[PDB]
Amino acid sequence: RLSPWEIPRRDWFPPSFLFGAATSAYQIEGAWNEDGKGPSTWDHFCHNFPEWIVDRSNGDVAADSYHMYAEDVRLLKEMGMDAYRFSISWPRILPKGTLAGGINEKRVEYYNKLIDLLLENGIEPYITIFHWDTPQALVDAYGGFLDERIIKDYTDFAKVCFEKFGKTVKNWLTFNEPETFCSVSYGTGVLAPGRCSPGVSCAVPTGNSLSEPYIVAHNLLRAHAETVDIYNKYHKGADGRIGLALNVFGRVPYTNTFLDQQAQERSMDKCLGWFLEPVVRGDYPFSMRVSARDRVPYFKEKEQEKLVGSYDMIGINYYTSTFSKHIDLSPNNSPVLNTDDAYASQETKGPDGNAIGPPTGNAWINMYPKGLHDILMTMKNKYGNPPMYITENGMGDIDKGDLPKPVALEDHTRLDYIQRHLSVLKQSIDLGADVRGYFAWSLLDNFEWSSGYTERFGIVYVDRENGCERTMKRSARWLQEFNG
Amino acid sequence: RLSPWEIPRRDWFPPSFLFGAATSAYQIEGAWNEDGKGPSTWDHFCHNFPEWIVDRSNGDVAADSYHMYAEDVRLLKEMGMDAYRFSISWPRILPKGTLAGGINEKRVEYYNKLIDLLLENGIEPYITIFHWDTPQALVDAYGGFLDERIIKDYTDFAKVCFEKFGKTVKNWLTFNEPETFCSVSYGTGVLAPGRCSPGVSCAVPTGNSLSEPYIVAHNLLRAHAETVDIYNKYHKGADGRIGLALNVFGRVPYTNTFLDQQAQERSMDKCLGWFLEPVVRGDYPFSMRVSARDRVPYFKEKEQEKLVGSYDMIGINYYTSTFSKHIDLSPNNSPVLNTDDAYASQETKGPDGNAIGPPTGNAWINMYPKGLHDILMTMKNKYGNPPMYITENGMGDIDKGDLPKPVALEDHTRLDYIQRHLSVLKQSIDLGADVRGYFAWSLLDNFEWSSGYTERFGIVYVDRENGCERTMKRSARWLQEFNG
Numbered sequence: 001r002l003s004p005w006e007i008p009r010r011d012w013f014p015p016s017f018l019f020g021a022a023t024s025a026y027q028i029e030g031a032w033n034e035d036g037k038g039p040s041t042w043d044h045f046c047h048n049f050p051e052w053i054v055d056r057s058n059g060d061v062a063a064d065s066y067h068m069y070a071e072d073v074r075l076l077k078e079m080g081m082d083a084y085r086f087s088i089s090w091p092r093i094l095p096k097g098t099l100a101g102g103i104n105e106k107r108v109e110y111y112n113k114l115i116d117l118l119l120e121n122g123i124e125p126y127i128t129i130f131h132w133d134t135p136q137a138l139v140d141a142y143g144g145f146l147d148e149r150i151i152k153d154y155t156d157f158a159k160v161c162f163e164k165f166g167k168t169v170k171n172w173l174t175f176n177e178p179e180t181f182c183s184v185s186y187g188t189g190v191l192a193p194g195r196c197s198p199g200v201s202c203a204v205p206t207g208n209s210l211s212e213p214y215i216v217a218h219n220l221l222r223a224h225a226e227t228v229d230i231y232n233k234y235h236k237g238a239d240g241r242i243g244l245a246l247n248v249f250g251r252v253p254y255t256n257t258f259l260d261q262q263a264q265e266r267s268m269d270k271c272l273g274w275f276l277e278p279v280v281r282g283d284y285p286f287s288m289r290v291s292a293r294d295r296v297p298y299f300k301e302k303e304q305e306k307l308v309g310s311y312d313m314i315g316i317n318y319y320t321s322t323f324s325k326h327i328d329l330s331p332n333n334s335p336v337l338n339t340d341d342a343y344a345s346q347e348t349k350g351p352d353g354n355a356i357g358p359p360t361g362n363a364w365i366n367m368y369p370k371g372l373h374d375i376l377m378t379m380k381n382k383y384g385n386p387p388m389y390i391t392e393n394g395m396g397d398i399d400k401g402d403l404p405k406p407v408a409l410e411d412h413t414r415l416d417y418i419q420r421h422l423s424v425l426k427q428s429i430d431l432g433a434d435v436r437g438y439f440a441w442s443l444l445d446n447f448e449w450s451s452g453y454t455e456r457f458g459i460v461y462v463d464r465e466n467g468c469e470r471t472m473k474r475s476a477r478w479l480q481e482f483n484g
Numbered sequence: 485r486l487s488p489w490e491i492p493r494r495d496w497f498p499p500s501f502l503f504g505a506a507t508s509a510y511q512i513e514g515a516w517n518e519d520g521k522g523p524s525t526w527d528h529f530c531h532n533f534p535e536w537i538v539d540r541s542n543g544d545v546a547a548d549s550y551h552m553y554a555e556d557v558r559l560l561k562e563m564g565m566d567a568y569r570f571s572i573s574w575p576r577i578l579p580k581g582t583l584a585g586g587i588n589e590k591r592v593e594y595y596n597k598l599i600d601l602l603l604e605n606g607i608e609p610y611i612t613i614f615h616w617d618t619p620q621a622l623v624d625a626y627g628g629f630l631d632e633r634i635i636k637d638y639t640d641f642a643k644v645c646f647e648k649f650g651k652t653v654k655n656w657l658t659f660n661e662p663e664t665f666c667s668v669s670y671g672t673g674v675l676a677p678g679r680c681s682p683g684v685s686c687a688v689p690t691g692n693s694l695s696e697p698y699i700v701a702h703n704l705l706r707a708h709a710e711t712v713d714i715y716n717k718y719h720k721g722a723d724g725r726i727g728l729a730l731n732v733f734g735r736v737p738y739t740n741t742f743l744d745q746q747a748q749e750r751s752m753d754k755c756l757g758w759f760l761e762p763v764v765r766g767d768y769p770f771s772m773r774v775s776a777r778d779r780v781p782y783f784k785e786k787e788q789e790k791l792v793g794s795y796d797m798i799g800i801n802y803y804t805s806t807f808s809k810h811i812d813l814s815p816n817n818s819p820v821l822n823t824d825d826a827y828a829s830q831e832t833k834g835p836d837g838n839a840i841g842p843p844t845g846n847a848w849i850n851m852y853p854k855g856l857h858d859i860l861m862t863m864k865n866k867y868g869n870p871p872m873y874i875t876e877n878g879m880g881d882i883d884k885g886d887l888p889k890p891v892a893l894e895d896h897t898r899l900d901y902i903q904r905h906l907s908v909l910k911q912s913i914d915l916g917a918d919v920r921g922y923f924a925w926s927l928l929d930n931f932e933w934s935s936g937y938t939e940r941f942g943i944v945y946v947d948r949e950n951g952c953e954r955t956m957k958r959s960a961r962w963l964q965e966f967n968g
Contacts, residue, residue, distance in 0.1 A: 258866050262770055286746055289813040290774050329773040382742050
């Protein structure tokens with residue numbers, strides 16, 4: 001699609017730049033109740049509310065990476081990847097969610113095998129501690145992230161990870177996509193545990209879409225601050241680094257008018273700022289407090305001190321952008337979802353009737369690589385230009401049982417998507433943004449949450465009817481050439 | 485103090501550009517109970533609360549312009565001024581504030597004589613309908629601007645002005661400095677009627693500094709919308725124009741940090757935006773509603789339609805600027821004055837310990853001509869670049885009762901102030917700002933509200949102990965030369 005001379009080459013990027021791919025434990029591992037592993041909220045959701053997954057599927061087997069992790073490493077090595085981002089399953093390590101319930105040795109051994117194999121192959125592990133898979137035992141006990149009790153259990157889990165793996169792993173991310181986790185698991189309720197306000201359509205409409213996202217977010221940020229403190233004190237040493245990975249939608253003012261520019265700013269605050277401003281300066285964005293008032297908790301003095309500057313790097317998970325269009329404050333508008341607190345509607349079509357960019361396959365990923373540049377300029381100019389990694393970037397191909405393997409392997413849309421994003425990343429780095437790596441989402445076709453297996457995001461095809469055998473797609477073959 | 489080659493020349497400005505001076509009725513007229521004139525809130529305030537004026541004075545005589553108006557016109561003509569901005573005293577036209585109480589024909593004749601003499605001399609009248617002098621009879625009846633009944637009475641007053649003077653006068657301003665009027669008469673209570681919350685230091689501490697300024701503002705804007713509708717329907721004809729004159733403090737972010745930039749924007753919204761956004765788009769700035777919530781009234785549908793675009797020109801009254809410094813939203817901060825709703829402290833000293841600019845004489849006007857440029861760029865780029873006039877610009881010399889006349893005449897500080905603001909104005913017009921005229925505040929030394937006669941703002945000296953005899957100061961002689 002790009003002309004030949006516009007296709008990125010490896011030396012567009014610094015020799016120390018990292019190219020990798022990313023996965024998460026629930027989406028790839030399978031072995032959901034094997035070797036002493038406890039259930040997560042995702043196990044519980046899929047098994048009890050199968051109707052809330054598009055194809056009524058689950059992650060019981062997924063891409064079977066608990067058993068096939070050696071294939072994963074082989075593929076990464078053959079492609080010449082420098083790094084691999086994966087997550088650790090909390091209830092695989094602590095089946096009851098707590099230290100008191102005991103550490104699952106077989107779970108520790110699995111990640112040790114994977115880390116060893118990566119390192120022996122010269123691939124640097126970037127580990128996500130939490131990727132949405134809360135131990136169901138903690139939900140049973142106290143509602144999981146809805147209660148401040150989560151903070152101690154999360155930090156004990158992270159501490160175990162640092163103890164078992166920290167000698168070998170020097171790059172850690174506490175939380176993946178906290179905004180999505182909060183807004184979509186507790187607001188719209190699409191993701192486990194599937195909670196929302198009465199009247200909102202989700203599996204468990206006995207929550208509160210205005211309050212619970214903020215509660216969960218607050219406990220998450222408190223857990224982040226404590227964990228980074230423990231890391232810095234006992235595990236960082238000379239070379240360790242810890243941060244978190246934020247999803248960020250690009251937001252473009254619906255018009256270049258002050259009302260919609262204001263809406264765009266409230267929208268950036270409500271997605272990026274909600275988590276970035278706490279770790280940058282120790283509190284939530286002003287716009288979030290002045291809007292949502294008492295629904296936004298306050299950090300304690302000691303926590304706050306720990307929160308300020310609690311990162312060595314920031315992960316950016318980038319998929320798409322929308323226009324942001326102003327909504328007036330009036331007796332006629334009452335927020336229903338936490339995201340309504342931004343007083344903005346997120347439009348995929350602009351005022352000239354055009355989509356922001358073309359669809360890539362699924363319901364929401366529109367192609368808009370410029371949005372990545374806009375976000376990186378914000379990071380550079382507004383928030384101090386911290387070290388950054390694009391910790392996820394990718395898109396999905398629809399497979400409703402209809403898609404022949406040869407067609408799925410010829411993933412030209414994804415190849416073009418990746419090339420165009422790498423082109424904009426080069427432009428951003430040339431403009432001074434401190435980006436140091438890029439990870440494709442995903443290494444593998446996997447369980448796409450509430451879409452089940454109907455969306456294939458992998459650069460590697462996973463054939464679930466043939467023992468999850470892996471085959472590189474055209475995108476993976478290009479990355480292989482690109483990496484040399 | 486500017487070098488000789490930096491002093492503005494008349495040809496820096498377009499041939500059609502207007503140079504004038506400005507006054508207001510209570511500050512210059514005197515004749516406070518003459519020829520059937522009714523009392524205003526300012527008559528009442530000075531007569532009942534002398535201790536709340538710095539020198540315990542009043543405007544009973546002022547500059548005696550009721551009798552000496554021919555001198556005022558002679559001075560304007562001798563200086564080569566193109567235009568004169570003055571105000572009409574509501575209770576001089578309607579002694580009881582209402583149509584029903586009758587029109588004071590001696591009052592009407594006075595303004596007719598002034599208008600006629602201005603026109604005979606080629607000087608264009610710009611008339612301010614209301615400059616803070618509410619008929620005290622309306623306060624007795626219903627609390628004046630605190631009640632929506634003010635709207636009908638104001639529009640009836642304005643209709644009388646249009647009917648009597650509209651054939652001769654083609655340039656009208658409904659209200660002067662609505663922000664100062666609201667914030668300072670009903671918030672800090674420094675100006676008549678001198679109201680503020682209990683615990684705040686003012687003459688009448690039985691008001692509400694959080695709610696009253698918004699009430700007065702809302703009624704004023706409703707009155708404005710109705711008046712412009714009447715003007716457009718019955719009086720505008722081919723050449724008439726109507727607008728309003730806004731005081732605008734320049735605001736500079738305390739640091740170039742997002743928090744203080746956000747604070748600067750809130751501050752601009754709370755001063756300029758409070759009145760400009762209603763007439764430009766039909767509602768108050770979002771930041772003002774999200775902050776002050778139920779204390780900000782909503783316009784009715786029909787009013788709102790009349791409010792949108794209710795101006796042919798905007799007057800800017802510019803004196804000084806401050807830094808704006810962010811205040812966090814927390815349980816530790818509780819607004820007391822309406823201006824606290826901006827969550828910003830206005831600082832005269834910046835982070836490096838330096839004043840924003842040097843004092844000019846009185847307690848608040850610091851020399852910062854660049855702030856005028858910042859404001860004009862905002863009007864150009866954000867609010868559509870409407871036709872604008874600098875309807876006031878000036879500063880005061882302190883006179884503690886002793887100031888030698890020969891010293892008062894040699895007003896080097898004022899001359900420098902005027903020359904420097906004219907130079908910045910030239911830069912702004914070259915950059916595309918649609919400014920069409922400049923009016924020095926003031927033609928005459930006058931009653932400076934709660935400072936009484938302790939501050940002389942005139943380009944013309946007024947000798948109150950010698951029959952209010954007028955003498956041109958150095959600044960006036962310069963203007964005379966400049967206008968040729």
